[PDB]
Every structure is written in structure tokens, then in C-alpha cells.
Scaffold this active site. Sequence first.
Site, PDB file in Angstrom:
ATOM      1  N   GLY A 290       1.913  -6.275   5.739  1.00 48.66           N
ATOM      2  CA  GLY A 290       1.930  -7.676   5.381  1.00 48.66           C
ATOM      3  C   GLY A 290       2.371  -7.908   3.954  1.00 48.66           C
ATOM      4  O   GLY A 290       3.290  -8.691   3.699  1.00 48.66           O
ATOM      5  N   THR A 291       1.727  -7.223   3.010  1.00 50.08           N
ATOM      6  CA  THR A 291       2.050  -7.432   1.604  1.00 50.08           C
ATOM      7  C   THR A 291       3.453  -6.944   1.282  1.00 50.08           C
ATOM      8  O   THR A 291       4.180  -7.592   0.522  1.00 50.08           O
ATOM      9  CB  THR A 291       1.035  -6.719   0.723  1.00 50.08           C
ATOM     10  OG1 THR A 291       1.219  -5.307   0.847  1.00 50.08           O
ATOM     11  CG2 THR A 291      -0.369  -7.069   1.156  1.00 50.08           C
TER      12      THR A 291
ATOM     13  N   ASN B  93       9.529   7.398   9.026  1.00 49.15           N
ATOM     14  CA  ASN B  93       8.451   8.363   8.879  1.00 49.15           C
ATOM     15  C   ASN B  93       8.580   9.540   9.824  1.00 49.15           C
ATOM     16  O   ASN B  93       8.396  10.686   9.407  1.00 49.15           O
ATOM     17  CB  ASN B  93       7.104   7.687   9.113  1.00 49.15           C
ATOM     18  CG  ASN B  93       6.519   7.126   7.852  1.00 49.15           C
ATOM     19  OD1 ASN B  93       6.529   7.774   6.810  1.00 49.15           O
ATOM     20  ND2 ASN B  93       6.003   5.910   7.932  1.00 49.15           N
TER      21      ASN B  93
ATOM     22  N   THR C 246       1.713   2.890  13.553  1.00 45.81           N
ATOM     23  CA  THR C 246       0.343   2.749  13.086  1.00 45.81           C
ATOM     24  C   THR C 246      -0.221   1.360  13.313  1.00 45.81           C
ATOM     25  O   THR C 246      -1.436   1.216  13.481  1.00 45.81           O
ATOM     26  CB  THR C 246       0.255   3.086  11.598  1.00 45.81           C
ATOM     27  OG1 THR C 246       0.727   1.973  10.831  1.00 45.81           O
ATOM     28  CG2 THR C 246       1.105   4.297  11.286  1.00 45.81           C
TER      29      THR C 246
ATOM     30  N   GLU D 100      27.811   2.304  -8.879  1.00 46.24           N
ATOM     31  CA  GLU D 100      28.858   2.890  -8.055  1.00 46.24           C
ATOM     32  C   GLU D 100      28.564   2.750  -6.571  1.00 46.24           C
ATOM     33  O   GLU D 100      29.477   2.469  -5.785  1.00 46.24           O
ATOM     34  CB  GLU D 100      29.035   4.353  -8.423  1.00 46.24           C
ATOM     35  CG  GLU D 100      29.099   4.559  -9.913  1.00 46.24           C
ATOM     36  CD  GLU D 100      30.104   3.647 -10.550  1.00 46.24           C
ATOM     37  OE1 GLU D 100      31.314   3.878 -10.351  1.00 46.24           O
ATOM     38  OE2 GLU D 100      29.684   2.694 -11.234  1.00 46.24           O
TER      39      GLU D 100
ATOM     40  N   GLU E 108      -4.716  -5.702  -1.970  1.00 41.44           N
ATOM     41  CA  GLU E 108      -6.090  -5.229  -1.930  1.00 41.44           C
ATOM     42  C   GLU E 108      -6.378  -4.323  -3.119  1.00 41.44           C
ATOM     43  O   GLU E 108      -5.537  -3.498  -3.490  1.00 41.44           O
ATOM     44  CB  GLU E 108      -6.371  -4.476  -0.629  1.00 41.44           C
ATOM     45  CG  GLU E 108      -5.412  -3.330  -0.318  1.00 41.44           C
ATOM     46  CD  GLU E 108      -4.223  -3.762   0.530  1.00 41.44           C
ATOM     47  OE1 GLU E 108      -3.711  -2.938   1.319  1.00 41.44           O
ATOM     48  OE2 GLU E 108      -3.795  -4.926   0.399  1.00 41.44           O
TER      49      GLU E 108
ATOM     50  N   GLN F 185       0.821  -1.200   0.000  1.00 45.38           N
ATOM     51  CA  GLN F 185       0.000   0.000   0.000  1.00 45.38           C
ATOM     52  C   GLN F 185       0.858   1.254   0.000  1.00 45.38           C
ATOM     53  O   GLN F 185       0.532   2.236  -0.673  1.00 45.38           O
ATOM     54  CB  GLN F 185      -0.929  -0.015   1.209  1.00 45.38           C
ATOM     55  CG  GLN F 185      -2.201   0.770   1.019  1.00 45.38           C
ATOM     56  CD  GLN F 185      -2.079   2.185   1.524  1.00 45.38           C
ATOM     57  OE1 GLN F 185      -1.033   2.581   2.033  1.00 45.38           O
ATOM     58  NE2 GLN F 185      -3.149   2.957   1.390  1.00 45.38           N
TER      59      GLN F 185
ATOM     60  N   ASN G 238       5.447  11.597   0.540  1.00 52.11           N
ATOM     61  CA  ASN G 238       5.804  10.933  -0.703  1.00 52.11           C
ATOM     62  C   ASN G 238       6.340  11.917  -1.731  1.00 52.11           C
ATOM     63  O   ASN G 238       7.102  11.524  -2.621  1.00 52.11           O
ATOM     64  CB  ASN G 238       4.594  10.183  -1.249  1.00 52.11           C
ATOM     65  CG  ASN G 238       4.110   9.105  -0.303  1.00 52.11           C
ATOM     66  OD1 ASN G 238       4.885   8.548   0.467  1.00 52.11           O
ATOM     67  ND2 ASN G 238       2.821   8.808  -0.355  1.00 52.11           N
TER      68      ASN G 238
HETATM   69  N1  LIG Z   1       5.855   7.224   4.308  1.00 53.83           N
HETATM   70  C1  LIG Z   1       4.716   6.610   4.019  1.00 53.83           C
HETATM   71  N2  LIG Z   1       4.389   5.439   4.665  1.00 53.83           N
HETATM   72  C2  LIG Z   1       3.234   4.809   4.381  1.00 53.83           C
HETATM   73  C3  LIG Z   1       2.373   5.329   3.439  1.00 53.83           C
HETATM   74  N3  LIG Z   1       1.311   4.510   3.351  1.00 53.83           N
HETATM   75  C4  LIG Z   1       1.480   3.487   4.211  1.00 53.83           C
HETATM   76  N4  LIG Z   1       2.664   3.666   4.860  1.00 53.83           N
HETATM   77  C5  LIG Z   1       3.236   2.768   5.868  1.00 53.83           C
HETATM   78  O1  LIG Z   1       2.764   1.455   5.656  1.00 53.83           O
HETATM   79  C6  LIG Z   1       2.631   0.785   6.889  1.00 53.83           C
HETATM   80  C7  LIG Z   1       1.528  -0.272   6.846  1.00 53.83           C
HETATM   81  O2  LIG Z   1       1.535  -1.024   5.652  1.00 53.83           O
HETATM   82  P1  LIG Z   1       0.595  -0.538   4.448  1.00 53.83           P
HETATM   83  O3  LIG Z   1       1.424   0.162   3.405  1.00 53.83           O
HETATM   84  O4  LIG Z   1      -0.487   0.354   4.993  1.00 53.83           O
HETATM   85  O5  LIG Z   1      -0.072  -1.842   3.803  1.00 53.83           O
HETATM   86  P2  LIG Z   1       0.851  -3.086   3.427  1.00 53.83           P
HETATM   87  O6  LIG Z   1       2.297  -2.744   3.652  1.00 53.83           O
HETATM   88  O7  LIG Z   1       0.586  -3.487   2.004  1.00 53.83           O
HETATM   89  O8  LIG Z   1       0.346  -4.247   4.400  1.00 53.83           O
HETATM   90  P3  LIG Z   1      -1.213  -4.614   4.366  1.00 53.83           P
HETATM   91  O9  LIG Z   1      -1.997  -3.531   5.064  1.00 53.83           O
HETATM   92  O10 LIG Z   1      -1.414  -5.933   5.062  1.00 53.83           O
HETATM   93  O11 LIG Z   1      -1.666  -4.727   2.935  1.00 53.83           O
HETATM   94  C8  LIG Z   1       2.334   1.874   7.902  1.00 53.83           C
HETATM   95  O12 LIG Z   1       3.106   1.679   9.058  1.00 53.83           O
HETATM   96  C9  LIG Z   1       2.758   3.166   7.246  1.00 53.83           C
HETATM   97  O13 LIG Z   1       3.815   3.739   7.969  1.00 53.83           O
HETATM   98  C10 LIG Z   1       2.694   6.503   2.786  1.00 53.83           C
HETATM   99  O14 LIG Z   1       1.932   6.972   1.948  1.00 53.83           O
HETATM  100  N5  LIG Z   1       3.871   7.146   3.076  1.00 53.83           N
HETATM  101 MG   LIG Z   2      -1.631  -2.773   3.034  1.00 55.83          MG
END
Ligand SMILES: Nc1nc2c(ncn2[C@@H]2O[C@H](COP(=O)(O)OP(=O)(O)OP(=O)(O)O)[C@@H](O)[C@H]2O)c(=O)[nH]1
Ligand SMILES: [Mg+2]
Lengths: 427, 50, 48, 89, 50, 426, 426
Positions: free
Chosen positions: A134-135, A196, A169, A244, A61, A10, A218
Site C-alpha cells: 500500500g505505502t 522475487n 504474499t 546514458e 508504520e 517496507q 536485498n
Molecule cells: N525482495 C524483497 N521484497 C520485499 C521485502 N520486504 C517486503 N517485500 C515485498 O513487499 C510486498 C508487500 O509490501 P510491504 O513492503 O511488505 O509493505 P508496503 O509495501 O509498505 O505496504 P504496506 O504493508 O501496506 O505498508 C511483498 O509482496 C514483498 O514481496 C524484502 O525485504 N525484499
Molecule cells: Mg508495508
Amino acid sequence: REVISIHIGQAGIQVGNACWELYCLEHGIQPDGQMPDAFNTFFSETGAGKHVPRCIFLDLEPTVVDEVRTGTYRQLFHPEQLISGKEDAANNFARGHYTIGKEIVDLALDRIRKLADNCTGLQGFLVFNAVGGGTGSGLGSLLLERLSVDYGKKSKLGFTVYPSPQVSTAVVEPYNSVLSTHSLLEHTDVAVMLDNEAIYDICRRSLDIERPTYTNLNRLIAQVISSLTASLRFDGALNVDITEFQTNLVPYPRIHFMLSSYAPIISAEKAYHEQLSVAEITNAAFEPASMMVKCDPRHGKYMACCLMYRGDVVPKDVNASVATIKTKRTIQFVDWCPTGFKCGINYQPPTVVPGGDLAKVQRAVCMISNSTAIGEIFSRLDHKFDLMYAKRAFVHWYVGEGMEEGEFSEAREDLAALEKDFEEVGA
Amino acid sequence: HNKQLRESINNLRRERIMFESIQSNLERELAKLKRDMADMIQQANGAFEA
Amino acid sequence: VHKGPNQAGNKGLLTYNNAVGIPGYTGFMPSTNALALPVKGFEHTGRP
Amino acid sequence: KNEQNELERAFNTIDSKGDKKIDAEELTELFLRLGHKPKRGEVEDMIWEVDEDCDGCISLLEFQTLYTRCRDDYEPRGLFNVVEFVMND
Amino acid sequence: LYYLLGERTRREHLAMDMKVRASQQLKKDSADDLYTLTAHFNEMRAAKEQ
Amino acid sequence: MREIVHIQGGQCGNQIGAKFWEVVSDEHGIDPTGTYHGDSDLQLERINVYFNEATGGRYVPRAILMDLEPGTMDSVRSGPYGQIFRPDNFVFGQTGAGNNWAKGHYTEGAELIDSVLDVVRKEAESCDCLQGFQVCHSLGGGTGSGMGTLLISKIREEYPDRMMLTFSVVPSPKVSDTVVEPYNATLSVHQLVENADECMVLDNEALYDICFRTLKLTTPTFGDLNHLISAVMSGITCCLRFPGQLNADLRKLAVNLIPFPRLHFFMVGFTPLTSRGSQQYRALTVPELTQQMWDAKNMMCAADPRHGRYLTASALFRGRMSTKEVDEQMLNVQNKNSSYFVEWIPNNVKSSVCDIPPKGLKMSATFIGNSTAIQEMFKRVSEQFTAMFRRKAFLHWYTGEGMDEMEFTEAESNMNDLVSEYQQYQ
Amino acid sequence: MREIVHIQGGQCGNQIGAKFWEVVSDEHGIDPTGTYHGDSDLQLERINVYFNEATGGRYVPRAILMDLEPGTMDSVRSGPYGQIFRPDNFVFGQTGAGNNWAKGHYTEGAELIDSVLDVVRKEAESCDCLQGFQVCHSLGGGTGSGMGTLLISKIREEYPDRMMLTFSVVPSPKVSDTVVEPYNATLSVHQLVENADECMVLDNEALYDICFRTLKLTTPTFGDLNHLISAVMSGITCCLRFPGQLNADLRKLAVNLIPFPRLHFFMVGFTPLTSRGSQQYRALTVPELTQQMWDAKNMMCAADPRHGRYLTASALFRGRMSTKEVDEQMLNVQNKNSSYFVEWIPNNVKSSVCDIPPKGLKMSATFIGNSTAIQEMFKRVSEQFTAMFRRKAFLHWYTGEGMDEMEFTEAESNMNDLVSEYQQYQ
Ligand SMILES: Nc1nc2c(ncn2[C@@H]2O[C@H](COP(=O)(O)OP(=O)(O)OP(=O)(O)O)[C@@H](O)[C@H]2O)c(=O)[nH]1
Ligand SMILES: [Mg+2]
Ligand SMILES: Nc1nc2c(ncn2[C@@H]2O[C@H](COP(=O)(O)OP(=O)(O)O)[C@@H](O)[C@H]2O)c(=O)[nH]1
Ligand SMILES: Nc1nc2c(ncn2[C@@H]2O[C@H](COP(=O)(O)OP(=O)(O)O)[C@@H](O)[C@H]2O)c(=O)[nH]1
């Protein structure tokens, strides 16, 4: 010379959603996909008046992915790339590595195959993911595994997002992080940590935006990546490619974790404020108030540093600047390397994004170093991992998925070995 | 608040560590230089006597 | 002795100045009233 | 020095592995010998506020400077008071 | 108590810093004197050669 | 007649050669389109040393560009005087070494060096009587040092009887680009002491200091540094390209400056070099040039020559001069600072005079000194080599490609015995 | 042939030297652009004493400007005849001493004197046969007095056999600009009594009185004072640059004037100096010049010689004059006022004639008298020095910088034995 970028999870494709917006604006491509040779490293010219990215979004998802499908970048981001699963891994490393990976990884790597065959001068891969989820952790590791057994010799640039110590989070982030590093160690060649909370403090302090969302985060991540590949995308007085860092920044096959930083991260009114030159940004790249990971580099000793310079810079002043840094004694180096620098200069200044909060600056610096504060980071995560693991908390989800305690324990002692490795090398 | 102050103190001590280390290195280099100094004195004396 | 750095006055082949002087003059002469050197015995480089 | 011979003897009898390092855990056994039960988070604080140069462990030089500092005069005397008890008895 | 401990350790750290700065000054002094002494030895070499 | 082919390796080598061919073409008066437009006839008889007549006044240089990344070649064709090279001489890889000596010497070399050897061979027998080869490259980069070094070895094996010039820049800790500088420089020098006939050592630190102090430039870009190196290279080769009252060929200078087969690392200077604000306030006499020539702050290495002795020295003059003044100036310099010269060799100075000055100047010189102050540079490098190698940093990106550890020990021992014999002859 | 290297220190020295080089260039007919535009050949044959031709009739002065604040350099380059100095001779600090003798002798001297020594070393080796040096500086300031003093000491220890002139303005209670005037003058005089061969004492008080009475000026700015001091210096060295019936070089004048190695503080004058209103009612004869020469109110120092005695005196005349008239005039002025001359030295006047008048005059003169009344000026300064030193006012600024108190005791003792031996010979 071409380089492809895959996005996992995500967070990864949100980063890509900002990155490619920056790319198409930087090369003058409208979001529908056509211009009104430097682009060749990211975009392949199909037919006439069209360019398609060298990328694949993938996620389990469909919500975030089809939001990309319905957003403004329908025509630019092509149909086959955007791989989407049916159901989430749900912050479960086992669910994202053993149940759903087995159905999605073959489709993904079969896409990467035909992408590499389309390409001719592939420099390497670069992945975008966060290990807290997770993903991102599970099939990210599974994908990197199959990419290593398929190509291996090609560089793999992993820009990961680690969980912050006090800002969090999710809850099972320690489990998923440790299980990610257990494979990230021996799969990625060059892996850059980006926290973050550091970006929060940067946007709070320098950009003086009180209420930031992920978008501004981002946005400056794309700034860093774009400033890293600018040497390939455009010619400079002293260019430096993707191979490099492989050589100049990694002194050992298992010590590859890089602190990154950027300067000048400045607002609009403050660009009016200050007189900018090379000396102060070369300084500001080294303060912890401008690093991308919430860690203290004064606690550590640098192993090697790399300096990307964009804009109007000559080699004279940058050489004078690193001279002042090497003779300063607020920061010290390892006794293993006298010459701990790797410079790079490119002519094109960093571009701006409408709605972005950065001002257009004459010149900017992207620092990427190697230190031992990272060795402190892994211990900080290891401590809170063992606190939860001691009570066998949340273990029944992974066990019920099909895993056991053996990989838990071996990943724990694997990080312990990494801790020992850092403490030995820093001496 | 106690934990905040404790963290600040810990930071200060960990920087004191770096400062004493660089002090030690500079002292080693200064000792080597004073050795070079004495050697130059001896060489000058030898040339003068010759 | 007579030749020295940084002065382009007395760099002519003759020690004196033929224009307004007799040999042994030891008076200053400009670079304009100073003789030029002979490069070689034959004067041209051409093959017709 | 006439106090200091017995100070360093007290130090090695507090230690068990005999080295420069003493852990909070050896401090727990010393507390068991004293007889009163320490708190849950007290012994880490007592070692942390005095361990200054190195970390986690406590060192002989650190113990020495701590002792001469606490001999002098609004100062943490966490481990100082307890070793002084060993010095007294 | 922790507040006062921080007030003390800050002063100690500043003392360490000033010692480091003095070490740098001594480094510069030693370098200059080494350069002068090498020049003197080369002069004596020229003298004994003549 | 007497022939010199040019070989450019790496990014620095290509940009240096670009400026070099710009200034040479300027001397011979050919326009950037490839045709003759000069005025004097003197330029015509000695363009066969550096060019080949193709068709209707089309003179293509006898150059060979060689690297592994198309950015440098594009920057060559971008600037002026880039349209004159033969496109077949753009022998060129595709992957890129990137600061990895093993990449430049063992893997990418195996498929690039046969091709460059083909074109350099064809360009060698294209002419009648070779004088030697002239290679411009670096000792810090990967595709320059490693590839160029193996090329030197292959060439010295095929044509062992011809001379060889190597203009090689060395890294210094004060102007430090990359991290593996000692791992590259030590190995390249280790190979150059048995393959190359002589090497003209350069470095960016001394050049930056020159443009700061003497030139008083504001922004010393790479264009001017390469501009200075080009003027040096034209100065050393001017004897063949033009008549003079005393001609000194390449082998003539070599036999005059090299007393022992391993003592062949030269430091170079150049005169005159003056700031533009003071450009008209100065004089042009042979003593004036000699004062600027023998200055220690005018050497193009980071080696103070007053910390050692000159084994030998040479000065090539260009312009209408009186050889009596030339020789007495050399005699005055040798008599006054008699301590800075070696004792057991009298008259340590070789001189030469050519009657054609560079464009825009009335009189110039080119100093080439084989001193013993260069051992400071090699100790300065070898000590960094030992500091890294003693704890095996960065070692595996080399050992994982075919190299082994005894090669590094060999380069250490060869570097050490070289500097010890320099210290011996001091 | 005979050579004079010019050295300017301090704001006073630089502005005086600016008007000096203007006047000299006017006399030799070279325009401010640096080319020759005169008419006779007499002007050409003696410009090697003062200039060096750069290239094609570009004559550059043989001068060295030395200071610590760029404002003086700007004021030098701004005015006419400013673009003639060589930019390399603008050796120059950045901080500023500011009326601190210790700053000019211990703090900034240590890093500026080496460079200025290299420049003056190159300027001295650029000529063949040194006659001497010519240093214009002040005694009140720091960057002029202390710095110039250190430079004089270094030069005297390097070139011991060459002459040396130094024109030094001295402070006075009536024209008292700065406050540490005695603290600077006493130490500087203590060093000029041992290093410099001879100096010419000047002061702003007598200059202001001259511009009020004789010139009858309305606004006597610093431009006119420097114009007077320039005219005097030109009158001194007219003898080397132009032939005459009786030559008297610098060394010739030194031996004719200095009876004892410490008696070399000369009061100077200049004639004719008449207002443009009264130039119509005057005549031009040697008596007309002489009776203005020996006038008490025409001395350029605040030391009325009729309070003391003359030891020796000299007159340098310029123009086609009758030497009988010259000598009978010196004899008559020695016989009329015989009491003011020393008794045990017959013929206390040396005279000399040069055949070239300054541009704008038919006949001029320059009086250089070594009187004994200069003990009045040094007494007037030493009493102020003691008055401050009695309870150590302003002392910490010097003692805290490296100096100690016994230097001051040394200075006042040397001043005291100086004044007492002048009083002895009176
Ligand atoms: N810097 C930054 N971190 C993000 C952003 N979106 C999600 N995260 C990080 O992603 C972590 C959670 O994983 P997600 O990206 O939400 O989802 P995922 O990694 O695919 O895991 P799942 O929810 O099981 O699908 C959180 O701790 C956030 O810190 C973003 O737009 N910018
Ligand atoms: Mg996710
Ligand atoms: N004088 C000069 N030096 C250069 C230039 N470009 C690079 N260098 C030097 O060359 C070194 C890097 O060599 P590099 O070009 O990367 O070699 P390569 O990678 O093998 O082609 C750096 O230390 C630079 O100081 C140039 O244009 N001029
Ligand atoms: N004749 C003359 N005297 C000057 C001039 N400028 C300053 N002075 C004198 O110099 C004295 C101060 O010395 P200063 O010039 O400051 O010396 P410095 O600070 O060492 O350069 C004052 O008493 C002035 O009378 C000038 O243009 N002409």
C-alpha cells in the site's frame, strides 16, 4: 556529480538497509560514520570526521523505521531523514494515496528540497519501492507525481519490485500493481523491474542456499545497484553515467521497462571451482536462469542492452564477447536497431559483505536490457486483475476510502494500451 | 502435473516461433547474396568479352 | 631491381664495396662496409 | 483435393466473420448446433492442443497441417474428430 | 497424451534448429564464393585495362 | 612562425591528445615538468609551432581541452605530462551531454561555446601567422561530436582562410560502443563536409586488427591505440617542425591530395609497425617500408582499398634516405598495381622527406591516401541510419530538444550524394 | 645473385632442415646468435644465396618452416641455432593432418596454402634472380607429403622457369613406421613426376645400414641421419657458394643428368664416411674417395644399382685436387665396369671441382647417380598399393574427404608407365 536515493515502503528501506551497508563498506566508512572524494556522490562531509547519506527512508508504520533507529546504524543514518508515519496504509492503494499521503508527502518533499539545495551537481533521483504493498504504491505514486511537477527534467530511476505470478504474499497485489503503473508509466523515466521468484531460483541454483530469507535477496540487490553507479563513484576506462540509460535504452517515451541481470552470482566453493573470464559471464548474463525477473527473454526480441563491467577487464575481450553474442542466433534482436549494445567498464572490483554468500570475484557483469517479455508480464498481471475485478471483489475498501470505478476502468484500458504498444513495436 | 507439462510444451512452441523467424531472415539474406553472386558472374563475363 | 624488401645487406650508396672490391663486383657486402649518404652541403646546425 | 474443397467450405461455415481466425466462442455456437453441452474448460483445451504456430486464434494453414497429420497414424484428435463429423454430415 | 505431444514437438523443434544451422553454413559458403568472385572480377578488370 | 593550435573534444579526444602531447614533448625533448632537457639544437627552432615560452624554459602547449565531465580532465592531470598544460586552457562544462548530439549542439553548446571561443581566440592572436587548426574528436559520443562540430563551424566562420585538420574516429558495427552511433555520425559528417577542410578518418576496429596481426599484442588497451594515433599525428606534422630535403606543409598536402572540394576524407597508415619478437629480425630499407605501407591490412580504416581506387596518395618519410630510391619505389608501386589507381590523373603520389626520425627509430613513414573505398564506410553507416530512422526509433530525445526531422533528411541526402559522387569518380 | 629459397614441411623436413641450417651456418662461420665470426672474406661474398642481413650483421636464413603440430616448432626452437629463424616465417596451422593425404591436400591445404604462399611470395620477391627452390619433405606422412606436394604444385604454376630441388624420404617395407605409406607415396609420386624438376630419393633403411657398417655407430638416432642428409645437401650447393676450377650449378647439373623429362629420380651418396676408429688407417686420395663413391653399399637408397644400369652420374668434389686424377678415375671406373652403364651414351659421368672443403675435411665428394634401378623401389611400393587397393582397405578415409577412386587408378597407372619406361631404357 551527486545522486540521492529515496526509499518508500517496507521493502524499500530494507533494500536501503542493505544498500548503504554495502556503500559504507565500499568507501571504507565505519557504521558510526567516519573514516579511520569518491564518496562525495553519496555522502556529505559535515564538520570533521563525519559523513551523512543522501537518502530518506519513509514509511507509514513505525516498526521497521525505528528498528533502523535502534539498530547498528544509529549514527550513520541521521535523525531528520527517517520519516515515519503513525499508522499503515494496510495494502490499500487508496489509503496510501488519498488519506495518509496528504499529510506525509509535503513533509517528505520539503525534506527533499533541502537535500537538493545541499547538493550541487545533482545527477538525478532513484527510488526504491515495491508496488504490491500500500505505502509503496500509493504515496510512492503521489511522491513521484509531486517530484515530476517540481523538477521534471531530472532523471528518476525507479527500481520496483513486482509481484511474482505464482509466489505471492498478499491478495490485492493486482489492484495495487495496476494502480501503480497507471502513474508509473508517465512519471518515471527509467524503471527497472525486479521480481522475487527469480531471485529465489538464483539463490537456489547458483548460490545453492536452500533456505534464503529477504536478507540475501536485498544483499544482491545492493550488488546490482552498486554495480550500476560504480561508473559515477569511481573512474574507469570507459565510464557511463545516469543520463546514458535515458538515451541509449529508451526508444520511446512510453516504453521504459528494463530487465536486469547480474553475473557471476556464485558461491564460495564454486569460485574455487570454475575458471572465470569475460566470455562465460557475458554468456551467463543472457540465460533466463540468471535474470532478475521470472520471464522468458527467448519469448521476446531485445530492443537494447547495456553491459556494466567491473573489475579487471580490457575492451578487447568484451568487444569480442559481444561480437559472439551478436553473431549467435539463440537470441535475436529487433529489426529496428542494428547496434543494440551499450558497454561500460570500471576498474574497481565488486566488494564483499561479511556474512554475505558471494565470493570475491575478479570481475562481474550487470546486464540491463529491454525486451517484450515485459509486455507478457503485464498481460499476465492484467488477466488475474480482471478475474478479481469481474466479481467486484475488495472494491468496497477503496470506494469506502473515497475512490470510484472510473480510475479502475481507465487503468485497465491504460494497461491494454500498453499491451498494444508493445505488440506493435516488437514487430 | 498436467499444467506443468502444458507450460513446458508452450515454452517449446514459443521458441520454435523464434527459430522459424530467424530462419526466414537468414533466407532473405541468402537470396540477396546469391543475387550478388549472379551479378558478379555477369560482370566477369562482360569484362572477358571486352 | 638490386633494391629489394627485407634485405639490409646491399643498401649502401656505392653499387660495389670499396673495401675489398672493384666496381661491378656483384659480391655480397655487409651493412658495416657500406657507405653513408650525404645529408646536405653544410654540416652543422648552430648559431653562436 | 476432392475432400479438401468441402473441407475449406466447412471451415468458412464454421467461421462467422469469414476470416482465418476462429475463436472458442464460435466453437461454442458450433457445439450448440451439434446439441451436446461442452464442459467448462474443454473447448479451450481442444483449441490449444491443435493451435500450434500462432496463438489464441486458429489459422487456415494450421488447420491444414493438423488435418493431414491427423489423417496419418497416440495423437490428439480433439478438434479433428469434431470437424470430421462436419465432413461426414 | 500431453507427454507424447511434448515428445513430438521436441523433435520438431530440433529439426528446425538443425535447419537454422544448415542455413548458417550456407551463409558462410555464399560469403566465401562472393569474395572469390569479386576477386576474379577485379582480376578481369586489370586484364582488360592492360 | 607557421602556427597550429590544438583542440581536443570529448573523452576519446582528450586521451588521444594526452598521448599526442606526450610523444611531441618527447620529440622536442622537454621533460614532463615543462623544461627543456634535450641534446640537439634542431629541437629548439621549431617549438614555436606547438608551444609558447612562458618563463625560464617553461614551454606550455598551445592546446585547448574541452568536454563536459570532470572525469576526463582528472585522467588528464593524473598521468604524466599532465602538469604542463595551462590551467586556463582547461575550459570545461559541468553537466555532461552523454551521447546526445542535440545536447552537444544546441543546449550545452550555447553556454560552453562562447567560452571556448574566447580562449581559442586569445590563443589564436597570441601567435603571429596561423597555419591552421588541429582538432581531435569522435563521431559517436555526444560532447565530442556535437560540441566539436559547432566549434568547427564557428571557427571556420571567423577564420575562413586558415587550414584545418580533423582527426575523427568513426564507429563500426563490429566494435560498437553505443546505440545512437548512426544518429551521431551521420549528422556530424553532414556538417563536416561543408565546414572542415579535410578529415583523417580513424576507427577502433582497424586499430584492434592491427595490434592483433602486426603488433601481436596480448592486451590492446586504449593506451596503445592512442599511441598509434599519436604517432600518425606526429608523422603528418613533422614537416613543419623539422628541416628536410623536400618540405611539404599542411596546405601543400591539401592542394596535392584534394581534387574536388567535397572529396576530402583521408585514410591513414603508418610504418614501420613490427612485433617485438620480430623486432630485431627485420631490415630497414625504403622498399621494406613501402611494402608495409601499401599493404591493405595496414590502413587505419575499415575500408579495403583494393575494393576501390586511390584518387591520390601521399607519403611523408622521416630519416636519412635517398630521394631517388623514394621516387622509384613510388613509381614501382604505381606501375605494378596500375588497376588500383585512377586513370585520368597521372603520377598520383606526392612524397616528402624530412631528415629527423622519431625517437628510437632509424627511418619511418606516414601514408595519407584519399581513396574511394571510404564510400563503403559511409554506406555501411547510412544504411543503419535508414534502418533506425524509417521507424523513428530514439528520435524523440533529439526532437524534444530543438532538432527537427528535416535535419535528418538533410543528412541522409548529403550522405547519399557524397557516396554517389565517390561512386561516380570510381 | 643466384638465389635458393628453402622450404621445410613435415616433422621429417623440419628436423632435417634444423641440422641443415646448423651445418650451413658452421660452413659460413656465423655463430648461433646470428653474427659473423669467421676469418676469411671467401665466406662473406656468397651468403646472399642463403641469408638476409637484418640489421648490423644479423643474418637470418631464407627458410620457411611449415607444419601443423607445434611440437616440431618447439623442438626446432629448443636446440641450438634455433633462434636464427625469422618468427614471421613460422607459418603454421593448428589442427594436424596426421598421415591423411586428403587432409594435407584438400582439408587443411585450402586455408594454410594461401598464407604460406604469401610468405614464400614475399621471400621470393625479397631476392633478385631466383636460381630455384629447395624443399625438404617426407612421403609417408600427411602434413609433409600432401601439403608439400600442393605447395610444389602452386609454386610450379607461379614461377615456371625456376629450378626446384626436393629431398624426399621414401617408405620401405623394412623400415615401415606408418600404415598408409603406399597410399601416400603413390599419390605424391604421381604428382612429383609432373611438377618437380628433379628429386633426390632418400630412405631410412639405407641410412641405418650406413650407420651400422661404415660409421659403426652404437646408437644411430635421428640426429645423425639428419647430419648425413645435411652433409649431402651442402655438397650439392657448394658450387654456388664457393668458386672452383670447374663450376657446376644446379641447372647445369640438371641438364647433365636428365635425358628425358620423366627420368629425374636420383640416388645419392656421400664420401668420405669412415669411423673415427679407422680414420687413422686410411689415406686421402681421389682413388680412395672414388672407390668409396661407386661402392654399392654407400648409396643412400635401397636400390642396388648392380641390379640395373646407370643412365648418367655426377660427382661433385670439394678441395684442392688434381683434375687429371679426377678424370682418369671417372674414365677408369667407366672402362672397368662397362656393362653396368648404358650403351648408347658415351661418357656417362659429369664431374666438377670446388676449391672449398667442408669444415673438418681435407677433400670430400658427392655422388649423384641417375640409375635405372629405381624401378625396383617403385615396383616395391606399387605392389603394396595394389595389394591394399584390390579390396579397398583404408579407402573410406580418403573417399569420404573429397577424393575419389579414379585418382588412385590415375596414380597407379602413372606409376606403372613410369616403371615400364625405366625398364624400357634398361
Ligand atoms: N525482495 C524483497 N521484497 C520485499 C521485502 N520486504 C517486503 N517485500 C515485498 O513487499 C510486498 C508487500 O509490501 P510491504 O513492503 O511488505 O509493505 P508496503 O509495501 O509498505 O505496504 P504496506 O504493508 O501496506 O505498508 C511483498 O509482496 C514483498 O514481496 C524484502 O525485504 N525484499
Ligand atoms: Mg508495508
Ligand atoms: N582509440 C580510442 N578510442 C576511444 C577511447 N575512448 C573512447 N573511444 C571511442 O569513442 C567512442 C565513445 O566516444 P566518447 O568518448 O563517449 O565521446 P564523448 O562522450 O562525446 O566524449 C567509443 O566508440 C570508443 O570506441 C580511447 O581512449 N581511445
Ligand atoms: N631421417 C629422419 N626421418 C624421420 C625423422 N622423423 C620422422 N622421420 C620419418 O618420417 C616418416 C613419417 O613421416 P612424418 O615425419 O610423420 O611425415 P609428416 O607427418 O607429414 O610430418 C617415418 O617413416 C620416419 O622414418 C627424423 O628426425 N629423421
